Tab-separated table of C-alpha atoms in Angstrom:
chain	number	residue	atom	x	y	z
A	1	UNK	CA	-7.318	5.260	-17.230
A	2	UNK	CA	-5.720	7.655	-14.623
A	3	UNK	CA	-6.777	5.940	-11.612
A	4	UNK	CA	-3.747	6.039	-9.058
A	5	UNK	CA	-3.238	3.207	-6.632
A	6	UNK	CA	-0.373	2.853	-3.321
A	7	UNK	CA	2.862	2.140	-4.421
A	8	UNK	CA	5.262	1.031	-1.843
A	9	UNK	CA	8.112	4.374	-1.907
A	10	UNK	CA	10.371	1.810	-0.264
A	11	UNK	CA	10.584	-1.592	0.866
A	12	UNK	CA	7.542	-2.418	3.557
A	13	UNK	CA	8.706	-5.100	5.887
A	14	UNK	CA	6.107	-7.980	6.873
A	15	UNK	CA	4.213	-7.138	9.753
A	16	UNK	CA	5.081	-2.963	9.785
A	17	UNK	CA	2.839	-0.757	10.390
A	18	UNK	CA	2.388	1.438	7.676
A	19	UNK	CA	3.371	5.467	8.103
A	20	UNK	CA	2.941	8.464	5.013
A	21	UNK	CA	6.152	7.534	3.990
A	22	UNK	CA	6.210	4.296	2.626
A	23	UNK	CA	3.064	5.205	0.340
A	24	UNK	CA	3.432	7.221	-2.665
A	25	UNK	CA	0.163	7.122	-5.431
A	26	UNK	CA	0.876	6.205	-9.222
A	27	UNK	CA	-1.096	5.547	-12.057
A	28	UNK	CA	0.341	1.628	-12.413
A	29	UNK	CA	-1.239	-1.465	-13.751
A	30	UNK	CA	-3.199	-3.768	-12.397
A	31	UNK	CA	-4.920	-1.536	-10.168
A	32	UNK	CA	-4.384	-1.583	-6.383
A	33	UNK	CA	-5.969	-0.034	-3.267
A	34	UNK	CA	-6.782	3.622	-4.642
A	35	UNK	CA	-4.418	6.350	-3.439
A	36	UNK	CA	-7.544	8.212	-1.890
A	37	UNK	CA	-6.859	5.139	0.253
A	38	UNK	CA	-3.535	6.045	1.610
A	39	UNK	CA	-5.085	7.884	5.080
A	40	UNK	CA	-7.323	5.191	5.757
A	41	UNK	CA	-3.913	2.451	5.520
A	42	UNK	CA	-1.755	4.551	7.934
A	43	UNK	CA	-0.778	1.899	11.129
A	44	UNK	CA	-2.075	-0.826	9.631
A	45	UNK	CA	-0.019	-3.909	8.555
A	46	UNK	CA	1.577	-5.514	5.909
A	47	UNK	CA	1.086	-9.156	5.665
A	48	UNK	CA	4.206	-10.074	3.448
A	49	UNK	CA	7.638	-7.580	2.798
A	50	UNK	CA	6.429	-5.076	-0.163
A	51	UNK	CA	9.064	-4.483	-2.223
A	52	UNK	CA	9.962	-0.712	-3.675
A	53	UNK	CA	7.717	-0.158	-6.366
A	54	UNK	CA	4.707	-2.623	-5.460
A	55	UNK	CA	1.326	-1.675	-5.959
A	56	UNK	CA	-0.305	-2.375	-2.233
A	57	UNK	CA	-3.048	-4.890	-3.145
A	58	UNK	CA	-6.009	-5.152	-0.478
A	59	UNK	CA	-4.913	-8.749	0.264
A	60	UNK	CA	-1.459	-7.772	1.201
A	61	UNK	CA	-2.761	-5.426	4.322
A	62	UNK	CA	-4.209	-6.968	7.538
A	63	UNK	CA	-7.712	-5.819	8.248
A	64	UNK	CA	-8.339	-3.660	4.856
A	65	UNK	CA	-11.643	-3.947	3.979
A	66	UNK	CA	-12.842	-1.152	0.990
């Protein structure tokens, strides 16, 4: 039920390192990386542009391991 996951607030280009910003939590389906998550992600990289709106999935993230 109300588990939130990372949600890409705007468009994350490939290969960006990731910054408080672009990560806002929501309660979306399927379930992504939990938003308790979100500290842990800041600097690391996106793998692929995340468009506005995407749920951040653990494969999309370089070196994200739960």
């Amino acid at each position: 039920a109300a588990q939130a996951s990372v949600v890409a607030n705007q468009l994350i280009p490939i290969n960006t390192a990731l910054t408080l910003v672009m990560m806002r939590s929501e309660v979306v389906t399927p379930v992504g990386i939990p938003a308790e998550d979100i500290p842990r992600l800041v600097s690391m990289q996106v793998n692929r542009a995340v468009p506005l709106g995407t749920t951040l999935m653990p494969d999309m993230v370089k070196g994200y391991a739960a």
